[PDB]
């Protein structure tokens, strides 16, 4: 069935699962042609495949060459995503293969299901959560590796840095979704919050700054205020 607020703790149990977000696979800039028509130019994209329990992020970089000479790119993008996820599962040892794959957008269900016919025991599920994974390209080090890529490439990250040494997966995912929701609602402000204090640095092998437990509470509170601020700016409340 579909994943939602009631079975939310299922994300952090011991059954391997992956979230797949395809919202940054096919990315374009829209522009005017010399003749005054409109055209698109693709830029590099990425599939965001995440184990919410461990923080392991399988970032498949989608190079613009994969669109060359193809039609109906937004539809192809869903099937290309499904093909790459299937190839990732086949590459993993049996005991690391997921038992469930949760897609963040319902249009991914049929493409992924068809590509995974060989894995009838892997459940493909939608979700009613509105997860902010599109904002992954607001993380500077992920954006940088995507834009610099000159060929298809898979890059592995832990999107929780070392947090699981100190907090639970449930709390780590809550933090990540709050960070990503903030970066999605007001990227500039969110980044300002995250970096205002220059004495707190991002280790070379990490994505986010090395906050103490106390400083994370402060940060998390600032991100809530940002989200509430934008919500009032938007709705005039």
């Amino acid at each position: 069935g579909a994943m939602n607020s009631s079975n939310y703790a299922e994300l952090f149990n011991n059954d391997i699962k992956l979230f797949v977000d395809d919202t940054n696979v096919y990315r374009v800039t829209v522009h005017k042609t010399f003749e005054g028509n409109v055209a698109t130019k693709a830029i590099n994209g990425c599939i965001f495949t995440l184990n919410p329990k461990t923080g392991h992020l399988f970032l498949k970089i989608i190079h613009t060459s994969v669109w060359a000479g193809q039609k109906r790119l937004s539809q192809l993008a869903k099937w290309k995503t499904a093909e790459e996820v299937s190839a990732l599962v086949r590459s993993l040892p049996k005991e690391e293969q997921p038992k469930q794959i949760i897609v963040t957008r319902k249009a991914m269900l049929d493409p992924l299901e068809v590509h995974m016919l060989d894995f009838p025991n892997i459940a493909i599920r939608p979700t009613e959560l509105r997860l902010p994974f599109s904002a992954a390209m607001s993380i500077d080090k992920l954006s940088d590796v995507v834009m610099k890529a000159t060929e298809p490439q898979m890059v592995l990250f832990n999107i929780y840095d070392d947090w699981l040494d100190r907090i639970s997966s449930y709390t780590a995912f809550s933090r990540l979704t709050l960070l990503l929701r903030a970066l999605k609602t007001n990227e500039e402000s969110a980044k300002m919050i995250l970096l205002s204090d220059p004495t707190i640095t991002i280790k070379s092998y990490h994505l986010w700054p090395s906050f103490t437990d106390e400083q994370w509470i402060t940060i998390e509170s600032q991100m809530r205020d940002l989200i509430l601020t934008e919500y009032g700016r938007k709705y005039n409340v």
Partner: protein, 300 residues
């Protein structure tokens, strides 16, 4: 012309034969239907006046034997049987005709409806979908399930239609996932037509048989099969031209014959809107689209 005599009519029942329906009262002096056109399969079907649960009936071809109906008070239904003694059968039929106890099959001469609904239906193929090999006729009813329904429970009483499933390894070639899911031509032409059915005529025979079981018995699994076989053709970008033109004729006569009052349960809104307006063959079913739009515009 041929005859299906009845031993008697002990219980009140609506008897239908092909697309026709009529009433027999409890212990009315009824002894069968005569003047049945040779050359076609036929279906004789029943709905008891006192329990409309279970429509049931028999597919048969009079060229294959002499058949009659006899009520069984233990099992509670009108049963078809074969009479092997041909002299006895002619004698029985001649006497009931002389007593004019047989109702006359009302085949209007201008009418090709039954031919058009059964053009590709052959008794030998019916007998593979409905397995009961000691008889030359085939029993079907409201509640019988299909092989595919039982996969998702008595197998002996099942409808063994050809399983169609658009998200199955049979439908989808490894490495052509997107191609094959969006254009079913491989599955239609190589898997089904070349591989399983051998030719378009056997494919159309199963499709027509499925429609007729849906309409006459309200058999839900047959309705599912009829729609699946339509959608497989309509969702294929490459279909022989002769199949498309025939499909349009087939569906036209099926829509024309459908009771208006049953359209709500026998017609799947999604399949028909997809086939007529979205599919590859959206422009290849002119007659079917015209009748659907004039007769059931609500569905669309």
């Amino acid at each position: 012309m041929n005859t299906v005599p009845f031993t008697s009519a002990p219980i009140e029942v609506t008897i239908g034969i092909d697309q026709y329906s009529f009433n027999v009262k409890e212990n009315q002096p009824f002894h069968g239907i005569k003047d049945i056109p040779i050359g076609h399969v036929h279906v004789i079907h029943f709905q008891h006046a006192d329990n409309s649960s279970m429509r049931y009936g028999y597919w048969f071809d009079c060229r294959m034997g002499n058949f009659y109906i006899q009520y069984d008070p233990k099992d509670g239904l009108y049963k078809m049987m074969e009479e092997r003694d041909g002299a006895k059968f002619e004698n029985i039929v001649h006497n009931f005709k002389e007593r004019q106890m047989m109702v006359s099959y009302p085949k209007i001469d201008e009418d090709d409806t039954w031919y058009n609904l059964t053009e590709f239906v052959q008794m030998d193929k019916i007998r593979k979908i409905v397995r009961k090999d000691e008889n030359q006729f085939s029993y079907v009813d409201s509640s019988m399930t299909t092989v595919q329904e039982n996969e998702l429970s008595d197998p002996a009483h099942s409808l063994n239609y050809t399983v169609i499933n658009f998200k199955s390894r049979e439908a989808i070639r490894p490495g052509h996932e997107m191609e094959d899911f969006l254009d079913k031509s491989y599955y239609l032409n190589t898997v089904m037509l070349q591989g399983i059915f051998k030719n378009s005529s056997n494919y159309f025979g199963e499709l027509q048989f499925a429609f007729l079981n849906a309409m006459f018995f309200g058999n839900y699994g047959s309705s599912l099969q009829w729609h699946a076989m339509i959608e497989l053709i309509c969702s294929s970008a490459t279909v022989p031209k002769h199949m498309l033109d025939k499909l349009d004729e087939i569906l036209y006569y099926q829509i024309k014959t459908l009771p208006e009052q049953y359209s709500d349960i026998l017609l799947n809104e999604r399949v028909w809107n997809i086939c007529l307006y979205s599919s590859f063959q959206k422009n290849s079913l002119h007659n079917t689209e015209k009748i659907m739009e004039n007769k059931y515009p609500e569905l669309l």
